[PDB]
Structures are given as C-alpha cells and as structure tokens.
mmCIF file of N, CA and C in Angstrom:
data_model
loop_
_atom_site.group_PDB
_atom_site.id
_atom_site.type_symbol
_atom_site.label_atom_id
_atom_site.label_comp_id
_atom_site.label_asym_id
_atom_site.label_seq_id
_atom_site.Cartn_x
_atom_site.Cartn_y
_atom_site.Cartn_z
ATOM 1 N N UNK A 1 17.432 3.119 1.129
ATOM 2 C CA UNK A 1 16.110 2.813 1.666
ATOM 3 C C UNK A 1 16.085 1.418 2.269
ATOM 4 N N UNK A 2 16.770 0.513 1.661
ATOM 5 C CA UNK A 2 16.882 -1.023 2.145
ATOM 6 C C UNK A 2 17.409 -0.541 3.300
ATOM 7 N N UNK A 3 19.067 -0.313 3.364
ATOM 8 C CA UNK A 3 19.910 0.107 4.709
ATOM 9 C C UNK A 3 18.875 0.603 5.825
ATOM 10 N N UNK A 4 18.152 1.183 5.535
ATOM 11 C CA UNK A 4 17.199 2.021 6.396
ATOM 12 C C UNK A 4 15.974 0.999 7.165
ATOM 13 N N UNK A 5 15.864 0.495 6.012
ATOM 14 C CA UNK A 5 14.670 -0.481 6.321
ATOM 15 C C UNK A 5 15.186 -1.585 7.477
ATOM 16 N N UNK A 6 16.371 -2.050 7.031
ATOM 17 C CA UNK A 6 16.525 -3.498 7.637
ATOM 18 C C UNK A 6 16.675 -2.577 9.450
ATOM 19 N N UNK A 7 17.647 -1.438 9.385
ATOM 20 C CA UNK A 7 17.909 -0.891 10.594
ATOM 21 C C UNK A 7 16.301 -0.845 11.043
ATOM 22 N N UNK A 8 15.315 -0.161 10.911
ATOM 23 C CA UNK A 8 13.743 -0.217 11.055
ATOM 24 C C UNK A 8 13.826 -1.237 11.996
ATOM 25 N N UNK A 9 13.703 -2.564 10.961
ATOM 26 C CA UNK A 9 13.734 -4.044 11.157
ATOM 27 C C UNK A 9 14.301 -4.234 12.779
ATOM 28 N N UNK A 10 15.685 -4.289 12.738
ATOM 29 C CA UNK A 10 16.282 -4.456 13.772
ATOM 30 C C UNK A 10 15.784 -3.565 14.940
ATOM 31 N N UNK A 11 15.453 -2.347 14.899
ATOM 32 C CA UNK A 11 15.123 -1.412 15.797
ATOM 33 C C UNK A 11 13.997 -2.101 16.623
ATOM 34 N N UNK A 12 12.986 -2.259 15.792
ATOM 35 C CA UNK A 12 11.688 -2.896 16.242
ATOM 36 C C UNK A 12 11.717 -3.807 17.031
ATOM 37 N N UNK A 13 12.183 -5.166 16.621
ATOM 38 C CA UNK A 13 12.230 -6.257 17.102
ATOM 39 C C UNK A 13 13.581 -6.780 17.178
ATOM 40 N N UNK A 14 13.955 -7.466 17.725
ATOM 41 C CA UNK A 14 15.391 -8.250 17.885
ATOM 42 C C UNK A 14 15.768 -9.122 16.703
ATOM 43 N N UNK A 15 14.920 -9.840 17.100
ATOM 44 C CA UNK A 15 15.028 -11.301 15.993
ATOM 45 C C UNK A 15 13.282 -11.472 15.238
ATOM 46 N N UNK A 16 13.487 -12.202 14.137
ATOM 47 C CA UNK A 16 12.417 -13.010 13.629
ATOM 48 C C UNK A 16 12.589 -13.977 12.724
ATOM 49 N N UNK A 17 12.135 -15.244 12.920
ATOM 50 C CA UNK A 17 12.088 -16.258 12.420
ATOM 51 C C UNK A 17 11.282 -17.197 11.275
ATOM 52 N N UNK A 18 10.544 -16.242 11.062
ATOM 53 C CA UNK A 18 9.984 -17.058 9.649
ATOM 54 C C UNK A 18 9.506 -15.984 8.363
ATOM 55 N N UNK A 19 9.789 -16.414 7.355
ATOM 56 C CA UNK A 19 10.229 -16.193 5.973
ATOM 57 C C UNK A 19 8.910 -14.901 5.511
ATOM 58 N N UNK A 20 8.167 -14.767 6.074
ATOM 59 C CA UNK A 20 7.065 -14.048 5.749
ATOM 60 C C UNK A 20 6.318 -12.826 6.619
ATOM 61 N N UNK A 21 6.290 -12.890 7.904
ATOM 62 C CA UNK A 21 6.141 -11.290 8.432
ATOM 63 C C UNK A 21 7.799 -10.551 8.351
ATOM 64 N N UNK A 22 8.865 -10.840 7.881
ATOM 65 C CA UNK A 22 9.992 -10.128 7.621
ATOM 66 C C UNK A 22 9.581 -9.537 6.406
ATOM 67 N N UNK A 23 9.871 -10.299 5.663
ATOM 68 C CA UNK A 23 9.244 -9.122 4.281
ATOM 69 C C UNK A 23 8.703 -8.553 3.986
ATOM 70 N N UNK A 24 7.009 -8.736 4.826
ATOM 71 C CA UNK A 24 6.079 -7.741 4.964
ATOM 72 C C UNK A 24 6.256 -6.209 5.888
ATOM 73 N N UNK A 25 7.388 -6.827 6.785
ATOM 74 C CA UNK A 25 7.425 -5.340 7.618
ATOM 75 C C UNK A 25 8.783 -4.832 6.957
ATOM 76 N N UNK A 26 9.761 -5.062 6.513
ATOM 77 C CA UNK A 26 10.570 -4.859 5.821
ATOM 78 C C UNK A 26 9.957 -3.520 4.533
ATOM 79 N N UNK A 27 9.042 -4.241 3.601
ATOM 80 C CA UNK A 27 8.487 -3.568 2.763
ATOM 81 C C UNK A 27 7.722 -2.767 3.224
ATOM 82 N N UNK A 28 7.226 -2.865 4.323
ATOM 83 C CA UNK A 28 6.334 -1.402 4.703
ATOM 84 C C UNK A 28 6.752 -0.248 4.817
ATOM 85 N N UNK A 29 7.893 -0.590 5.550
ATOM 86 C CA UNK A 29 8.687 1.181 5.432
ATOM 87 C C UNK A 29 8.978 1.800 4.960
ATOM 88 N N UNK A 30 9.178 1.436 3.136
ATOM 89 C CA UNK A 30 8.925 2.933 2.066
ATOM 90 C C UNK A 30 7.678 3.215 2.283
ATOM 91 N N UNK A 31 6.516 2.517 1.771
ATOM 92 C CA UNK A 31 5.752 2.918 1.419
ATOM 93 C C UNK A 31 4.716 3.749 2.702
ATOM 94 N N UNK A 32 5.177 3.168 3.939
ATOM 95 C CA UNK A 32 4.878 4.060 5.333
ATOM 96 C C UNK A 32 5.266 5.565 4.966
ATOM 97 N N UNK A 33 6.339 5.432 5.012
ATOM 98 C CA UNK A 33 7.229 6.757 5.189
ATOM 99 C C UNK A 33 6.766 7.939 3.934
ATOM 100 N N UNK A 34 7.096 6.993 2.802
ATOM 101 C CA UNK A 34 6.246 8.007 1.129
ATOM 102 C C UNK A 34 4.578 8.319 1.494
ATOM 103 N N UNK A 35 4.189 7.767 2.173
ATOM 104 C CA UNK A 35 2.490 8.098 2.201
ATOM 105 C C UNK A 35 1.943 8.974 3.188
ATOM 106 N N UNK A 36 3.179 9.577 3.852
ATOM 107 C CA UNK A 36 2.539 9.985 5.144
ATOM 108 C C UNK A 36 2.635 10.136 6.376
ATOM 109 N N UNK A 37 1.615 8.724 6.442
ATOM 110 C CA UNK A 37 1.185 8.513 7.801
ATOM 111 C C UNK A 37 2.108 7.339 8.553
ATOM 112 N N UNK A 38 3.270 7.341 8.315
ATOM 113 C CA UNK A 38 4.246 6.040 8.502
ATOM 114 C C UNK A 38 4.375 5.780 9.666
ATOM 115 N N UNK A 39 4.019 4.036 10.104
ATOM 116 C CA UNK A 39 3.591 3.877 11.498
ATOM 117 C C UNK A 39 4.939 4.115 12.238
ATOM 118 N N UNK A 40 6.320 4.796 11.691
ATOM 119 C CA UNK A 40 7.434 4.787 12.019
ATOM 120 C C UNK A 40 7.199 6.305 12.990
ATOM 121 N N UNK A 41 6.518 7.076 13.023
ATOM 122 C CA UNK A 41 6.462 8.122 14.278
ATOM 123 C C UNK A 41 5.509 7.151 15.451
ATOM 124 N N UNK A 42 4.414 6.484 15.637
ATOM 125 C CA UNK A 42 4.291 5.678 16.503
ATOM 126 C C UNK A 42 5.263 4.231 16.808
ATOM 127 N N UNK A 43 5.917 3.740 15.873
ATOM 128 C CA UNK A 43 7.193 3.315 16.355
ATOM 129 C C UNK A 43 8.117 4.089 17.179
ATOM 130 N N UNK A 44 8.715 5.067 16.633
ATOM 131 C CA UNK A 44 9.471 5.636 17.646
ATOM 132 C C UNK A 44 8.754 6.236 19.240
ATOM 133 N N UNK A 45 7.640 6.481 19.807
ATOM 134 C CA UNK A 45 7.145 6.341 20.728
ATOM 135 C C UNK A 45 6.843 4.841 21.427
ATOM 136 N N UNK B 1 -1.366 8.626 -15.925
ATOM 137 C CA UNK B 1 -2.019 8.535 -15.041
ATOM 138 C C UNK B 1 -3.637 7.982 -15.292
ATOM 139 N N UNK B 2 -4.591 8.313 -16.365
ATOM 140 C CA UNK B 2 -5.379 7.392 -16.455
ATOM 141 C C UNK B 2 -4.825 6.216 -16.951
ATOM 142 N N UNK B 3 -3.857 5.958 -17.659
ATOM 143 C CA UNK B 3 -3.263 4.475 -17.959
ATOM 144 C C UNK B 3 -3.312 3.527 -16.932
ATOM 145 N N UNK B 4 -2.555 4.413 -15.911
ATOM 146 C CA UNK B 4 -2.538 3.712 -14.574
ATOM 147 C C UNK B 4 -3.670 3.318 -13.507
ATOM 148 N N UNK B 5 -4.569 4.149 -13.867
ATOM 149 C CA UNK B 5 -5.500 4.503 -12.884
ATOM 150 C C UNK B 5 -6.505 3.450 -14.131
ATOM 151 N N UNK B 6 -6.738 2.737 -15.502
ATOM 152 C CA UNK B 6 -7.091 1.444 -16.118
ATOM 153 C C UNK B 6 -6.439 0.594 -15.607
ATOM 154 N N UNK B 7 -5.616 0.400 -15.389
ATOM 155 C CA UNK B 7 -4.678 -0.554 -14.399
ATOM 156 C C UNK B 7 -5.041 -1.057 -13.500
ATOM 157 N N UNK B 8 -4.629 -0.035 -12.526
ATOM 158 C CA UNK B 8 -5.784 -0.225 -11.189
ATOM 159 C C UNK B 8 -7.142 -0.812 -10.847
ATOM 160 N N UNK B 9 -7.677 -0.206 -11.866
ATOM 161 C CA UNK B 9 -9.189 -0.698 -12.042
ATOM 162 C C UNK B 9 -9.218 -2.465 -11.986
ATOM 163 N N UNK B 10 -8.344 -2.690 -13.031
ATOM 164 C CA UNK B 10 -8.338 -4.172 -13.839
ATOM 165 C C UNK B 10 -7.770 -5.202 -12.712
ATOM 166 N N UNK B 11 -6.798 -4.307 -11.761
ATOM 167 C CA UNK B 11 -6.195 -5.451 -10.971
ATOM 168 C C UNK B 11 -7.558 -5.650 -9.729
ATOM 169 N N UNK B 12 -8.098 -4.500 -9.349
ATOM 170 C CA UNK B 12 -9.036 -4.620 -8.314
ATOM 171 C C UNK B 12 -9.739 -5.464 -8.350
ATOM 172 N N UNK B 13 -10.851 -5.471 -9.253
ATOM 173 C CA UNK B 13 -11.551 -6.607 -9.904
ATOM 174 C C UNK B 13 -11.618 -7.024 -11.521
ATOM 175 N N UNK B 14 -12.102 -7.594 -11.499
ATOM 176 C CA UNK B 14 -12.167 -8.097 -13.059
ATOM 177 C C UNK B 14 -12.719 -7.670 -13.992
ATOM 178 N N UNK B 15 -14.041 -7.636 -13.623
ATOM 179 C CA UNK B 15 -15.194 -6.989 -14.613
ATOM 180 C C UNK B 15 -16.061 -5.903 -13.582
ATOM 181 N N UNK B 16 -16.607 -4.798 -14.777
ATOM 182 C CA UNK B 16 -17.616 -4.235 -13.836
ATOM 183 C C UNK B 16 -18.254 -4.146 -15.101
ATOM 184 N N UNK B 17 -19.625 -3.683 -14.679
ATOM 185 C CA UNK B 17 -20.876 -3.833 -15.889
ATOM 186 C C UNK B 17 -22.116 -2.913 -15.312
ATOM 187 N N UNK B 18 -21.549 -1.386 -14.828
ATOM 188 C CA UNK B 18 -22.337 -0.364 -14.098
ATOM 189 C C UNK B 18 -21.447 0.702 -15.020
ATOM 190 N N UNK B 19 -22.097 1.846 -15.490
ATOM 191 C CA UNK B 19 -21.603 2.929 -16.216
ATOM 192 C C UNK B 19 -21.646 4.498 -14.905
ATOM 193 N N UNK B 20 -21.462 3.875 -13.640
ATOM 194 C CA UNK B 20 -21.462 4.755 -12.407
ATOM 195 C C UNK B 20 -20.180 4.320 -11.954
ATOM 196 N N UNK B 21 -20.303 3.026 -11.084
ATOM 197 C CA UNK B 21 -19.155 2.813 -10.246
ATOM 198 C C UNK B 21 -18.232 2.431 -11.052
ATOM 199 N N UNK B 22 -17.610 2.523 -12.558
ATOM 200 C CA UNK B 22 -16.875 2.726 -12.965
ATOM 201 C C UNK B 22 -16.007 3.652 -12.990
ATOM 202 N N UNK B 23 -17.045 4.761 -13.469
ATOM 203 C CA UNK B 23 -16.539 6.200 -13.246
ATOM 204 C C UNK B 23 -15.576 6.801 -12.023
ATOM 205 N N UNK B 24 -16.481 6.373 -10.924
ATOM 206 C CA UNK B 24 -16.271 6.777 -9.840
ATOM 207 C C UNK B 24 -14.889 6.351 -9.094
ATOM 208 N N UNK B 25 -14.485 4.741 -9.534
ATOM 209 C CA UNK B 25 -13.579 3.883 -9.031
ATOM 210 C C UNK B 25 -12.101 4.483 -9.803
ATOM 211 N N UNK B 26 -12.250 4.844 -10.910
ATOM 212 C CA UNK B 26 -11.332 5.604 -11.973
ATOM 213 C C UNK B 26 -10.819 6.505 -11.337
ATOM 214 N N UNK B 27 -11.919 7.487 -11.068
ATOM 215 C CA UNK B 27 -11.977 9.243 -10.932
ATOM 216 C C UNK B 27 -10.805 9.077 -9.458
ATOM 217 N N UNK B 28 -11.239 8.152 -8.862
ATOM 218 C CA UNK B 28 -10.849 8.056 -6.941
ATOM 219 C C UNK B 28 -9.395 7.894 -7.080
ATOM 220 N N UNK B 29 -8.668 7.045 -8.248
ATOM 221 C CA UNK B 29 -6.916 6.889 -7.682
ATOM 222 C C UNK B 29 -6.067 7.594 -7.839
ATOM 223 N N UNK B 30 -6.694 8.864 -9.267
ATOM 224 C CA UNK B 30 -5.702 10.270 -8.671
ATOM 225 C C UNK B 30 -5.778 11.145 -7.551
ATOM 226 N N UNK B 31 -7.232 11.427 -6.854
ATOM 227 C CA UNK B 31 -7.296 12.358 -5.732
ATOM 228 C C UNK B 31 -6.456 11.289 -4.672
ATOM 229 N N UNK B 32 -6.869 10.095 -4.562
ATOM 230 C CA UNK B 32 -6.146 9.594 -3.858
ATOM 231 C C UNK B 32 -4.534 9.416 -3.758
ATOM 232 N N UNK B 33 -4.169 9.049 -4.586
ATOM 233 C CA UNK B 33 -2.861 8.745 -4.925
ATOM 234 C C UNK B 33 -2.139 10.815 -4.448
ATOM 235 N N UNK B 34 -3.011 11.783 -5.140
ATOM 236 C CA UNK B 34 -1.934 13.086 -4.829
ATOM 237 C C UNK B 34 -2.256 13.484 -3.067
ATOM 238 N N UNK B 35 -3.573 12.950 -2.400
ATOM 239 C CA UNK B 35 -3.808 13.514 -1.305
ATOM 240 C C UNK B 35 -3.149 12.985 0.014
ATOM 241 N N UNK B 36 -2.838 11.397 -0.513
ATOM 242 C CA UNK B 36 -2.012 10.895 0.764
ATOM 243 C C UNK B 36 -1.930 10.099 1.153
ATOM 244 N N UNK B 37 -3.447 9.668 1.647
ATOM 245 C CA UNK B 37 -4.289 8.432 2.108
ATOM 246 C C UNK B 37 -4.365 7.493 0.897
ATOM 247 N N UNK B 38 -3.931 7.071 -0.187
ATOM 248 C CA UNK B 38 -4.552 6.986 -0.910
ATOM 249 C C UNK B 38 -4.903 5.475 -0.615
ATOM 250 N N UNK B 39 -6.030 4.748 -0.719
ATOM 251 C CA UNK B 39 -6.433 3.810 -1.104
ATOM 252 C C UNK B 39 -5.620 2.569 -1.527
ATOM 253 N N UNK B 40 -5.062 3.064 -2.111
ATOM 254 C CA UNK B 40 -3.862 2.243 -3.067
ATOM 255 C C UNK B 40 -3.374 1.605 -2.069
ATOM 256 N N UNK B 41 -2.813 1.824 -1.237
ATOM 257 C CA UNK B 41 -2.101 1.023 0.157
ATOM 258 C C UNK B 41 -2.955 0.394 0.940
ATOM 259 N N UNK B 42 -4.384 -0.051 0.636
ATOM 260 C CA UNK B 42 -5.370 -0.789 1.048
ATOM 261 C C UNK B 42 -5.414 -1.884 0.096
ATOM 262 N N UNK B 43 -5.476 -1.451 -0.840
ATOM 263 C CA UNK B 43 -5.629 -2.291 -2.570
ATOM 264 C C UNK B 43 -4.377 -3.315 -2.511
ATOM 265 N N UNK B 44 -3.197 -2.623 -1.976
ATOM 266 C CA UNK B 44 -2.383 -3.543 -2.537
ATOM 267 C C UNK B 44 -2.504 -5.290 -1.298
ATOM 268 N N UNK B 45 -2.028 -4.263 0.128
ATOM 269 C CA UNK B 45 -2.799 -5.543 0.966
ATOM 270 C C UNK B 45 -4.727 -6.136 0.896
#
C-alpha cells in the first residue's frame, strides 16, 4: 500500500518540497481507495 | 463496535449534556462507517 502510495505520489506531481502536504496526500490514498469514492478515478482522468 | 463508536464520540467533542444528540451521534458511526461515506473521513480532517 506504501509502494502504491508513493507511486500515486509521483504520478500526480513531480516533485514536492515541504514536509507537510506530502504526508497528507501520501496518507490519503488508503483511505481514498478503502472508502470508495477515491479521488484516484478523478486522478486518473 | 459500540466501544468504538464511545470512542468516536469522546474524540469529536468532549462533553455533551443532551439525552438526543447523543443518541443520534452514536447510532450515525456504524451506518456510516458500513455504508461508505462515512463521516469518519470528515472527523478525522
């Protein structure tokens, strides 16, 4: 799920630089994906 | 699951002192939690 996540990560955006929207979007993607409505099908569009 | 769902309650707010929206706030994190949407992913951000 990490492996998955960080790829997410990278997919999304290239780079990011400070210590705190990484972890927040990092951690979103279980709980996206387990709930549902995971903004990861409007990501992939 | 009510263990959890006292839990919940306690982290949301602190005190309540209504013998309604107690009930009600309880009753809400299992439909929520099995239906999808649940709340809980509001609560936590």
């Amino acid at each position: 799920m990490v492996a998955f996540g960080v790829a997410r990560q990278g997919i999304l955006r290239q780079n990011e630089q400070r210590w705190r929207w990484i972890f927040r979007s990092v951690i979103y993607e279980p709980y996206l994906a387990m709930f549902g409505q995971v903004p990861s099908d409007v990501d992939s569009t």
